Amino acid sequence: DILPANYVVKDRWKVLKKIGGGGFGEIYEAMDLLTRENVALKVESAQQPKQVLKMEVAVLKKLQGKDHVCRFIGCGRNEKFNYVVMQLQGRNLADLRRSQPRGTFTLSTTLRLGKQILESIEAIHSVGFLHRDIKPSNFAMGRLPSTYRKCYMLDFGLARQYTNTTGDVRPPRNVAGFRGTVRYASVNAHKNREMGRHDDLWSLFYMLVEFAVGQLPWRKIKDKEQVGMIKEKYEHRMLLKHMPSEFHLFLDHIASLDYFTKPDYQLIMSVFENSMKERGIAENEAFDWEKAG
Numbered sequence: 001d002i003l004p005a006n007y008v009v010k011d012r013w014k015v016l017k018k019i020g021g022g023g024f025g026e027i028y029e030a031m032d033l034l035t036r037e038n039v040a041l042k043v044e045s046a047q048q049p050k051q052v053l054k055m056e057v058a059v060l061k062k063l064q065g066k067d068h069v070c071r072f073i074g075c076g077r078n079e080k081f082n083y084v085v086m087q088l089q090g091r092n093l094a095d096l097r098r099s100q101p102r103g104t105f106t107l108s109t110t111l112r113l114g115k116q117i118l119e120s121i122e123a124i125h126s127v128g129f130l131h132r133d134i135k136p137s138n139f140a141m142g143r144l145p146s147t148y149r150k151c152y153m154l155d156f157g158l159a160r161q162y163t164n165t166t167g168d169v170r171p172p173r174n175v176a177g178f179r180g181t182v183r184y185a186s187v188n189a190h191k192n193r194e195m196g197r198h199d200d201l202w203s204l205f206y207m208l209v210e211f212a213v214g215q216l217p218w219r220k221i222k223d224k225e226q227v228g229m230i231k232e233k234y235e236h237r238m239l240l241k242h243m244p245s246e247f248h249l250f251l252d253h254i255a256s257l258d259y260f261t262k263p264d265y266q267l268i269m270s271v272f273e274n275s276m277k278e279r280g281i282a283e284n285e286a287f288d289w290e291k292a293g
């Protein structure tokens with residue numbers, strides 16, 4: 001570990017325990033000695049050849065003001081490490097789904113989370129970045145009375161700017177080795193093609209099927225190439241057998257997109273809102289992990 005327990009960063013953030021990472025950087029839960037709340041602290045070695053924290057802080061700062069984004073607390077660089085401190089969130093959607101009796105969320109919870117996640121994807125795209133690792137463990141519910149029903153997008157370590165300085169789409173590289181988690185990667189990512197906005201929406205599509213059905217066909221198939229070949233040959237409409245019928249428009253829309261084209265986020269938002277309206281799903285409903293009725 002880069003930092004041991006009780007290490008104090010900038011005489012303010014006291015490391016409590018490691019909560020993630022290890023390879024590119026490490027993430028800790030820390031005590032803010034000024035404000036007295038716990039926070040998340042990510043560190044990366046100053047000697048590391050591939051350093052992402054400067055880009056990760058840049059995305060986090062650009063997103064301040066948007067919903068579904070952690071508050072920026074601080075950042076810095078010294079001779080041993082670079083660091084970023086941000087608001088700490090709670091339970092992630094991978095753990096919440098596995099804690100459900102049959103490993104599935106209800107359609108009520110699935111669709112409401114889908115709307116929140118779509119909002120966060122449109123937000124990162126609006127500031128010129130792709131997330132590239134949209135997955136349930138990168139979405140966490142709040143941990144406060146003011147946030148416990150809000151879902152947050154986490155971790156910009158694998159993000160990439162898809163625009164130049166003037167808002168134009170950058171050229172795609174001729175090959176781009178995909179970095180994201182195998183289970184939720186799009187077929188385009190599996191082909192090592194430059195990712196676009198549509199590839200983050202493919203990851204959302206797979207997450208929502210997994211939430212409502214409880215599994216994907218390639219779950220626990222670990223080999224990258226084999227998973228991509230299954231997805232390439234799999235009839236995606238078969239994934240929609242027990243999903244709301246309007247998801248066929250979502251699938252058809254994202255299947256029509258290419259690297260360059262801006263998605264129709266409103267079309268996808270309507271798929272979720274219309275699916276909820278038809279089933280009488282309201283925003284005030286308890287999420288599955290909430291008790292008392």
Ligand SMILES: CC1(N)CCN(Cc2ccn3ncnc(Nc4cc(O)cc(Br)c4)c23)CC1
Nearest residue numbers: 019020040041042084086088089137154155156
């Ligand atoms: C599984 C994952 N990808 C995402 C979850 N973190 C652990 C975790 C648990 C609760 N929270 N709240 C805020 N930020 C977190 N991570 C975080 C990620 C960053 O990239 C930068 C910073 Br600062 C914190 C985090 C481990 C790496």
